[PDB]
Amino acid sequence: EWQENKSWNAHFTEHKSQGVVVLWNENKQQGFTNNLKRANQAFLPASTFKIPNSLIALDLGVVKDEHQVFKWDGQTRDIATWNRDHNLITAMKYSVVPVYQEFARQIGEARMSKMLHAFDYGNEDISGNVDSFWLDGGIRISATEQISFLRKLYHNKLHVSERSQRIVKQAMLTEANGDYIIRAKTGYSTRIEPKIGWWVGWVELDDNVWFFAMNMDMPTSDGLGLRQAITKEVLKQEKIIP
Amino acid sequence: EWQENKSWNAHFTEHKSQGVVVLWNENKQQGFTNNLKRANQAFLPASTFKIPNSLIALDLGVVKDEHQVFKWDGQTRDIATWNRDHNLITAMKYSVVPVYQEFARQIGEARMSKMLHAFDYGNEDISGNVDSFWLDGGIRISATEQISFLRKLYHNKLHVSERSQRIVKQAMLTEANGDYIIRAKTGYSTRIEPKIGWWVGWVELDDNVWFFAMNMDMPTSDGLGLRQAITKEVLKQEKIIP
Ligand SMILES: CCc1ccc(-c2[nH]nc3nc(-c4ccc(C(=O)O)cc4)cc(C(=O)O)c23)cc1
Ligand SMILES: CCc1ccc(-c2[nH]nc3nc(-c4ccc(C(=O)O)cc4)cc(C(=O)O)c23)cc1
Ligand SMILES: [Cl-]
């Protein structure tokens, strides 16, 4: 059961931006969004795809554990934090694309397509380069589809080991305090118009979990901070966090 | 290998308190404390014992997972947060002794004694009520010994399943942001002199981990927040956290 709350649109325009936030009250099985139509519009997952991609690599053995070090290849890229060694935790934290492209090549389109299909993920379509399809290929997913996927991950229901799921949820850790825990993943889709930013994940409270999926128009990298900032405004307005 | 830095004692005497903080740089395998002597004085672990107790309960089956509920027994106790239902995550967060006391009774002295010996935990001695020995019984552990145990937990080297260890580390989650992650457990030892507060755990950074164990004289519960505050002041001084 879904409910539209366009009042949330205030938080978008206050920064003269456009997008959608989707929330899902797990206890109540109820959903809320500012825009039912955009909530179902499909986009490239971009770096939010690091979630199923991590799940896959772990379960296959491409990645042995969250400590395994993936050494920098020496290629200087535009994001400083990519130019260094990473493990699964920091690779997901800094959205280190080259580390995940390498995982993809080792996974291979055969097992990749199989797994996504098992995950019922987006349009399950891996068409394009096997190491760049989630950034410029044919995979597509909507905010509402993000929340469907994440809810399986949360419940360890995905067709992978509990371990792989446990590890990926550890790597999604973004913020934690005495009031709440956020496990989430950012995304920035730049290669194909429209350019959008993603933030998807959930908020753990003592007695409930709120799943969320947001995306917003992101013409320039400068507004990337708004992904978290606007979601939190929505979270604060609905009294989910202080 | 160990350095004493009594400059840290300022952070204690800025709150008219005394105690010890012990830090361990895992990369360099070097330790730091303001008080070498008190670092090696053993006390009741009190609710810090929730770390091994959880690992044991999990590994035998007293606790199925972190989602399983343990309902309030209707007995109204001094701590408001105890008088409600709990899972492993919230019982840790709020130090709900009754839930762990019930764990202990189900655990039984035979299996308890065994595990603590396998853990090399403190003096490995559970003399007293099987459901209260960590609060008023014979078990003792020092700050340095806390750190020894915690490093085994961090590296998954304890003699329980990886799963048990991953779950307890999830339940230890205390604080996280873009700069650091803190997994820790608080303790208040009130039943036996001297009354002391505990805070033990570690700070995960991108490319290092700092283990810590601190304890301080705690006459009344009013000074309890100083356990985290003084630790963070020391972490700040050492440039571990901002
Ligand atoms: C194929 C040529 C080419 C070369 C470089 C880029 C590129 N520049 N800056 C990029 N930033 C991200 C990114 C940013 C934030 C987040 C975030 O989540 O905050 C993620 C990715 C990604 C890419 C990318 O390679 O797709 C970026 C794009 C295309
Ligand atoms: C058997 C008689 C009796 C009854 C009740 C208590 C008792 N009152 N308040 C207590 N608070 C804690 C506690 C506080 C903070 C933290 C913390 O970590 O922040 C933990 C425990 C513990 C006990 C206890 O039962 O030992 C407390 C003590 C003795
Ligand atoms: Cl975690």
Residue numbers in the entry:
A (entry chain B), B (entry chain A): 24 to 265
Publication text:
Prevalently, drug-resistant bacteria produce β-lactamase enzymes that hydrolyze and inactivate the β-lactam ring, thus preventing the covalent inhibition of essential cell-wall biosynthesis proteins, named penicillin-binding proteins (PBPs), which result in the loss of drug’s antibacterial effectiveness. OXA-48 belongs to the carbapenem-hydrolyzing class D β-lactamases (CHDLs) and together with its variants represents one of the most severe threat of resistance, compromising efficacious anti-infective treatments. Isolated for the first time in 2001 from a patient in Turkey, the OXA-48 enzyme is now widespread across the world and is commonly identified in Escherichia coli and Klebsiella pneumoniae. We then prioritized the 4-ideneamino-4H-1,2,4-triazole (SC_2) and pyrazolo[3,4-b]pyridine (SC_7) derivatives for further investigation and demonstrated by biochemical and X-ray studies a reversible and competitive binding mode within OXA-48 active site for both series.
Importantly, the most potent representative of the latter series (ID2, AC50 = 0.99 μM) inhibited OXA-48 via a reversible and competitive mechanism of action, as demonstrated by biochemical and X-ray studies; furthermore, it slightly improved imipenem’s activity in Escherichia coli ATCC BAA-2523 β-lactam resistant strain. The overall density was unambiguous and both chains included the carboxylated form of Lys73 residue. A salt bridge and hydrogen bonds between the positively charged Arg250 and the benzoic acid moiety were observed. The carboxylate group was also oriented in such a way that also Lys208 participated in an ionic bond. Additionally, the distances between the carboxylic oxygen and the hydroxyl group of Thr209 and Ser118 below 3.0 Å were consistent with the formation of hydrogen bonds. Moving on the upper part of the binding pocket, Arg214 established a salt bridge and hydrogen bonds with the 4-COOH group, as well as a cation–π interaction with the phenylethyl moiety of the ligand. The carboxylate group on the pyrazolo[3,4-b]pyridine core was also involved in a water bridge hydrogen bond with Thr213 and Tyr211. Moreover, the central bicyclic aromatic system of the ligand established a π–π interaction with Trp105. Overall, an unambiguous binding mode was obtained consistent with that seen for reversible compound ID3, where dianionic moieties clearly engage the positively charged Arg214 and Arg250. The obtained crystal structure therefore proved compound ID2 to occupy OXA-48 binding pocket with a reversible MoA in line with the aforementioned experimental results.
